[PDB]
Amino acid sequence: SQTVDLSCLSGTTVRFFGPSHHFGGFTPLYDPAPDKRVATVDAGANALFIGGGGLNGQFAKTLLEEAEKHGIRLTPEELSQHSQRIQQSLLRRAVKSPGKLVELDTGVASPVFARSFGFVPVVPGLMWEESEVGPNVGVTFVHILKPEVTPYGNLNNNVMMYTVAPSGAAPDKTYSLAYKTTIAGVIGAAAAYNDTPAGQQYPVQGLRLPLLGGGIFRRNRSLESIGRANAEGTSLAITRYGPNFELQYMYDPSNAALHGLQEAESTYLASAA
Numbered sequence: 001s002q003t004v005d006l007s008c009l010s011g012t013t014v015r016f017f018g019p020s021h022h023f024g025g026f027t028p029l030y031d032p033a034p035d036k037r038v039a040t041v042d043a044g045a046n047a048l049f050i051g052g053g054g055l056n057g058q059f060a061k062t063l064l065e066e067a068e069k070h071g072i073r074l075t076p077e078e079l080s081q082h083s084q085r086i087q088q089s090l091l092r093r094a095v096k097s098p099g100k101l102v103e104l105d106t107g108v109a110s111p112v113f114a115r116s117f118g119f120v121p122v123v124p125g126l127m128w129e130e131s132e133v134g135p136n137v138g139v140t141f142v143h144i145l146k147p148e149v150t151p152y153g154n155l156n157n158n159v160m161m162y163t164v165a166p167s168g169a170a171p172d173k174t175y176s177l178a179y180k181t182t183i184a185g186v187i188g189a190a191a192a193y194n195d196t197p198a199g200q201q202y203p204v205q206g207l208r209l210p211l212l213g214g215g216i217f218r219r220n221r222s223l224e225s226i227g228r229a230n231a232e233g234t235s236l237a238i239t240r241y242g243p244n245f246e247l248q249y250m251y252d253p254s255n256a257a258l259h260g261l262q263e264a265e266s267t268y269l270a271s272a273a
Ligand SMILES: [Br-]
Pocket: 020, 021, 022, 028
């Protein structure tokens, strides 16, 4: 990988991953010997389950494999239904206190989650058409994982996030608004989490991100337009919340997130001329 500080993100450290040793080069969600706590952001489904294909399926696999090692009986179907129930409940609570981090009651049982939070920057569907961007867009969840499903048994791998990105089929104007809102929810939820009691003990020191909306959600939208939305949304979210953590972009052979940030960086260099 290559790591640089971006002036257009107020000096935030960004790590751009190259191809991994794995088939297809995909970046692992969690590392075997991390020296800081990097929360990886699931490109979630509108229906809020952990499962299915792509990156969301890789999160399911990671959690299911750790559970199996610990002798926890947890099927993919149980994980899908459970994570959906938890996150539906968090979404309901978050919509009732929009723009605030909300926490699920600690009395709720979970085989995977020790503590769970939700955040909507604005009520989904209030400022855009759900028929265009899709349901539940902009919600981000933060989960502290139970030790028994924490990758490598390493405490620095005990936080995941889960975010619902807009559909690429939406018109440009509303897509840009929904996308910027979504990135605000990602950075804002993590920054807010770091101001909770749980976050004092387990601070998030980096985010590991895909290009959100860049998989099956993009439909016929160009990766270029999505990289531009990500660069603008990330710049704005960092201006709002001033997070201390670094950003990492998982390997993408299109380099779409990278290209969006490169364009914004050069523009920033020229902003006084
Ligand atoms: Br690797």
